[PDB]
Enzyme design. Structure first.
Site, PDB file in Angstrom:
ATOM      1  N   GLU A 123      35.771  24.721  42.325  1.00 41.62           N
ATOM      2  CA  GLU A 123      34.566  24.645  43.151  1.00 41.62           C
ATOM      3  C   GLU A 123      34.207  23.206  43.511  1.00 41.62           C
ATOM      4  OE1 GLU A 123      34.675  27.362  41.153  1.00 41.62           O
ATOM      5  OE2 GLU A 123      34.119  28.950  42.554  1.00 41.62           O
ATOM      6  N   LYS A 153      56.313  51.062  50.077  1.00 45.47           N
ATOM      7  CA  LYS A 153      56.086  50.782  48.662  1.00 45.47           C
ATOM      8  C   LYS A 153      57.387  50.815  47.869  1.00 45.47           C
ATOM      9  CE  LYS A 153      51.666  50.532  46.922  1.00 45.47           C
ATOM     10  NZ  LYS A 153      51.217  49.878  45.663  1.00 45.47           N
ATOM     11  N   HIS A 187      38.929  45.342  49.779  1.00 47.15           N
ATOM     12  CA  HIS A 187      39.008  44.604  51.037  1.00 47.15           C
ATOM     13  C   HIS A 187      39.050  45.537  52.242  1.00 47.15           C
ATOM     14  CE1 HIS A 187      40.159  41.768  47.945  1.00 47.15           C
ATOM     15  NE2 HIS A 187      40.030  40.770  48.801  1.00 47.15           N
TER      16      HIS A 187
END
Ligand SMILES: *[C@@H]1O[C@H](CO)[C@@H](O[C@@H]2O[C@H](CO)[C@@H](O)[C@H](O)[C@H]2NC(C)=O)[C@H](O)[C@H]1NC(C)=O
Ligand SMILES: *[C@@H]1O[C@H](CO)[C@@H](O)[C@H](O)[C@H]1NC(C)=O
Ligand SMILES: *[C@@H]1O[C@H](CO)[C@@H](O)[C@H](O)[C@H]1NC(C)=O
Ligand SMILES: *[C@@H]1O[C@H](CO)[C@@H](O)[C@H](O)[C@H]1NC(C)=O
Ligand SMILES: *[C@@H]1O[C@H](CO)[C@@H](O)[C@H](O)[C@H]1NC(C)=O
Ligand SMILES: *[C@@H]1O[C@H](CO)[C@@H](O)[C@H](O)[C@H]1NC(C)=O
Ligand SMILES: *[C@@H]1O[C@H](CO)[C@@H](O)[C@H](O)[C@H]1NC(C)=O
Ligand SMILES: [Zn+2]
Lengths: 596, 195
Positions: free
Chosen positions: A357, A463, A487
């Site tokens: 951060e 997949k 998402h």
């Protein structure tokens, strides 16, 4: 006067008013996030409504300036960012329908309850109930039951909502002069009007597939090793040539493979580097950690931190009555106000999160002089990659010994580097095939190449061929397996997690090249390298003013995303995996299934 | 011992806007520039033309004190030969300026939690300002080719905007109080130096 002068004057007015209103809204949002009260909720809602109304009004007013007659390529960028007609193009009925649909998606995902059989009272949510089960419990039956229950109870409700969402998003994309919603998503990387730096929306797919083709062998070797280890752990559930089961991938969806480390450690007799007890011995607190992070960032030539950062940011949990969200974030409120919201504990993970951060804050401070509409990363991948490189550099044993955290008598042996590289690969390498598969499937779904009734029929060949994962229980069209992810259910683009991965390694090798690092790349450090700091700052200060290709070339000398640094990072690990897997089958078969 | 008040200038309870800067005439004085370092770490004290290093022993005809408030970023624009919003549309200094400029932070006074909208500045103008000129007219600026007719609208903007100071702003956005001392030498008895 020409149109360009009018546009410049209007942009000056918009910059002033938008700066003021955005600062007010951000301050209200920060007060809510650091203090959860209903009055803060209503203040945040009022501020957000005012900001949205102002933005819509200014977009409508700016729509009256046609783009073609504005030169200088800078006013044109701001006008493009401002116009953005968006969902308002369609009828108000369709707009409110989409708002309601997305609200229902978010509500269903957030309030998804899974109740154990024979007792409709011990129900659990994603956090912390089922996350702990899928991240810590090694029981086959419990993981399979949770997998099936989530894919059966949540996706089926979202399936018609997802279909309507896809149809109406395609309608918006066609109404906004785009081929499909995937083209609208890919339009972020588009660059026009600059010679030698033009980028097309169709070039992104070619670049992504080209990079994944080169990544494939390393991931395949890692998959073989993980399959062998899972066989040593679960001898009765994996075929010698079949794919790995879905619910044995360490988490709910198989996005990350870190949870198998305790299961897949090659040399468990050598403990990893953990300096939390060292910080306990010296009684390190949060402010000391942030001072160390600031010292690291100053050592590379980056400036100080503002006094308001120390006065205003909340670096410790308040406990008692004051409740707040402990998600670590960096806030740029505007007008020179930078803060960090973090519930810091005495843990090396928080020690790296502090650097992460802090890098975010440094990037935000870099382009504070740009106009209001140009204060962002050059694209959606540079910002988090710049955040990640500082965390990568700060975690090396050299840096830990430099600050006295690690005893000087710690001598590195190649077992430790092998373990560290495997741990890194379980997280970085594992998620690339999943990200590519999900993005490609969504692109085909939006494009229309995949028929409705054959969504899931298609979804399970990739997949097996791309990520090499076979489902434990067959699913028909009733289920909606993809929507179980946060998402896609909240309508966020997923490709930003791919390019970022291929950016944070292109920067580092360049940055380490400025520090004249000698030896392996994974043991690098950019501390005391003011030249590297200047090289990075020359790109950080640009913001959104220049094309992302030019910004990338400013640091690495290339105008396109490259994967060679990533493979160079894992070269000793690649050799070790080749040596270990020389006596094992390489590849997988797409025909075997655990359910036969 | 006739000491005229720099206390009514530096210690004024309220200053003026940059576009309406306050000009004060000072004459027939014992000018004591020696004792002026009684402000909270006053960041800027720069003199052009006349040496600050104890050159107060020189007799001037008159002195002007011009006071206003700006933000921290534009303090650099109060100087000869500078370009910007303040230097062009609000307050312009001559290229051959002689005098001193004193600027000190004022966050503890001029900042309010809900915002200080009292201070204004000029954002649009037809042409730049001549040195030591002032403009107070509030006629709305015309950017397009159609008449504005005194009503705000498309390509017709109000020329004056507000700083809106707050205590949580950065150092470059915090209020700063500026006082400019201008010295003249004329064909006159020139009775303002003071021991
Ligand atoms: C970065 O530079 C600083 C200062 O030059 C280094 O800190 C000193 O390192 C020496 C090396 O043994 C110690 O003896 C000193 O006690 C340290 N502190 C000082 C001089 O204040 C730091 O080690 C350097 N880090 C790297 C990774 O090169
Ligand atoms: C948090 O909010 C409560 C109630 O709104 C208030 O009493 C308290 O002072 C606030 N805390 C801070 C640090 O402002
Ligand atoms: C573009 O406009 C900016 C003002 O926003 C100006 O500083 C710059 O010189 C212009 N560039 C060109 C090439 O005219
Ligand atoms: C939406 O805005 C764009 C860009 O200004 C414009 O081309 C388009 O015509 C607008 N559509 C509607 C329905 O207003
Ligand atoms: C701020 O950074 C400078 C170098 O850029 C350094 O000399 C100074 O010590 C830093 N400030 C503090 C309080 O350490
Ligand atoms: C570490 O280096 C030694 C020395 O050559 C070698 O014998 C050993 O096999 C290496 N370990 C690994 C895991 O490669
Ligand atoms: C302003 O007042 C203080 C005391 O109230 C005094 O020390 C200072 O000298 C005054 N300012 C000037 C310019 O005289
Ligand atoms: Zn981050």
């Amino acid at each position: 006067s020409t149109i360009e002068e009018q546009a410049k004057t209007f942009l000056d007015k918009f910059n002033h008013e938008a700066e003021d209103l955005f600062y007010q809204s951000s301050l209200a949002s920060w007060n809510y996030n650091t203090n959860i009260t209903e009055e803060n909720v209503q203040n945040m809602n009022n501020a957000g409504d005012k900001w949205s109304a102002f933005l819509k009004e200014q977009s409508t007013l700016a729509q009256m300036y046609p783009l073609q007659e504005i030169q200088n390529l800078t006013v044109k960028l701001q006008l493009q960012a401002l116009q953005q007609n968006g969902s308002s193009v369609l009828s108000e009925d369709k707009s409110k329908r989409l708002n309601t649909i997305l609200n229902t998606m978010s509500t269903i995902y957030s309030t998804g309850k899974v109740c154990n059989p024979d007792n409709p009272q011990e129900c659990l949510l994603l956090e912390p109930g089922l996350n702990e089960i899928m991240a810590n419990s090694l029981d086959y039956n419990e993981r399979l039951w949770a997998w099936e229950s989530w894919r059966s109870e949540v996706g089926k409700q979202l399936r018609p909502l997802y279909e309507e969402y896809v149809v109406l998003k395609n309608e918006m994309a066609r109404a906004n002069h785009y081929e499909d919603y995937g083209d609208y998503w890919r339009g972020d990387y588009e660059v026009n009007g600059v010679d030698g730096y033009d980028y097309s929306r169709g070039q992104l797919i070619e670049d992504v597939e080209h990079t994944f083709e080169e990544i494939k062998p390393l991931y395949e070797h890692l998959h073989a090793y993980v399959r062998a280890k899972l066989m040593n752990a679960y001898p009765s559930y994996i075929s010698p040539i079949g794919c790995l089961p879905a619910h044995l991938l360490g988490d709910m969806w198989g996005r990350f493979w870190t949870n198998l480390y305790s299961l897949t450690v090659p040399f468990g007799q050598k403990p990893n580097i953990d300096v939390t007890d060292a910080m306990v011995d010296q009684a390190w607190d949060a402010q000391r950690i942030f001072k160390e992070a600031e010292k690291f960032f100053v050592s590379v030539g980056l400036p100080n931190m503002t006094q308001g950062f120390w006065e205003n940011s909340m670096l410790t949990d308040p406990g008692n009555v004051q409740k707040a969200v402990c998600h670590p974030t960096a806030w740029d409120l505007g007008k020179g106000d930078f803060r960090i919201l973090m519930c810091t504990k005495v843990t090396m993970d928080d020690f790296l999160t502090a650097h992460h951060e802090m890098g975010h804050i440094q990037y935000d401070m870099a382009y504070a002089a740009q106009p209001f509409l140009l204060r962002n990363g050059a694209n959606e991948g540079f910002h988090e990659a710049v955040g990640e490189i500082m965390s990568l550099s700060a975690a090396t044993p050299k840096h830990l010994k430099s600050i006295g955290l690690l005893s000087p008598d710690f001598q590195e042996d190649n077992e430790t580097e092998i373990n560290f590289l495997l741990k890194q690969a379980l997280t970085i390498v594992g998620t690339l095939p999943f990200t590519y598969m999900l993005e490609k499937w969504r692109w085909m779904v939006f494009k229309g190449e995949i028929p409705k009734d054959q969504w899931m029929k298609k979804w399970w060949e990739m997949k097996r061929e791309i990520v090499g994962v076979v489902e434990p229980v067959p699913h028909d069209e009733t289920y909606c397996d993809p929507a179980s992810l946060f998402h896609v259910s909240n309508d966020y683009s997923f490709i930003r997690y791919y390019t970022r991965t291929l950016y944070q390694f292109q920067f580092q090798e360049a940055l380490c090249q400025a520090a004249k690092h000698e030896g392996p790349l994974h043991k690098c450090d950019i501390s005391n390298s003011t030249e590297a700091g200047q090289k990075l700052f020359n790109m950080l200060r640009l913001g959104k003013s220049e094309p992302w290709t030019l910004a990338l070339e400013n640091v690495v000398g290339a105008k396109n995303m490259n994967v060679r640094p990533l493979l160079n990072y894992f070269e000793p690990l690649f050799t070790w995996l080749k040596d270990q897997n020389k006596n094992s089958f390489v590849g997988w078969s797409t025909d075997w299934s655990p359910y036969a | 011992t006739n000491l005229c008040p720099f206390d009514e200038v530096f210690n004024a309870t309220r200053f003026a806007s940059v576009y309406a800067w306050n000009r004060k005439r000072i004459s027939n004085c014992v000018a004591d520039y020696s004792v002026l370092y009684n402000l909270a770490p006053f960041f800027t004290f720069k003199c052009y033309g006349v040496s600050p290093t104890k050159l107060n022993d020189l007799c001037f005809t008159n002195v002007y004190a011009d006071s206003f408030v700006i933000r921290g970023d534009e303090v650099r624009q109060i100087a000869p030969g500078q370009t910007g919003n303040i230097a062009d549309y609000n307050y312009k200094l001559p290229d051959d300026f002689t005098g001193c400029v004193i600027a000190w932070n004022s966050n503890k006074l001029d900042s309010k939690v809900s915002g200080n909208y009292n201070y204004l500045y000029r954002l649009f103008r037809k042409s730049n300002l001549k040195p030591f000129e002032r403009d107070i007219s509030t006629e709305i600026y015309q950017a397009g080719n159609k008449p504005c007719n005194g009503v705000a609208g498309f390509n017709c903007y109000f020329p004056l905007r507000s700083y809106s100071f707050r205590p949580t702003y950065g150092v470059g956005h915090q209020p700063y109080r500026v006082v400019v001392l201008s010295f003249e030498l004329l064909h006159a008895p020139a009775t303002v130096c003071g021991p």
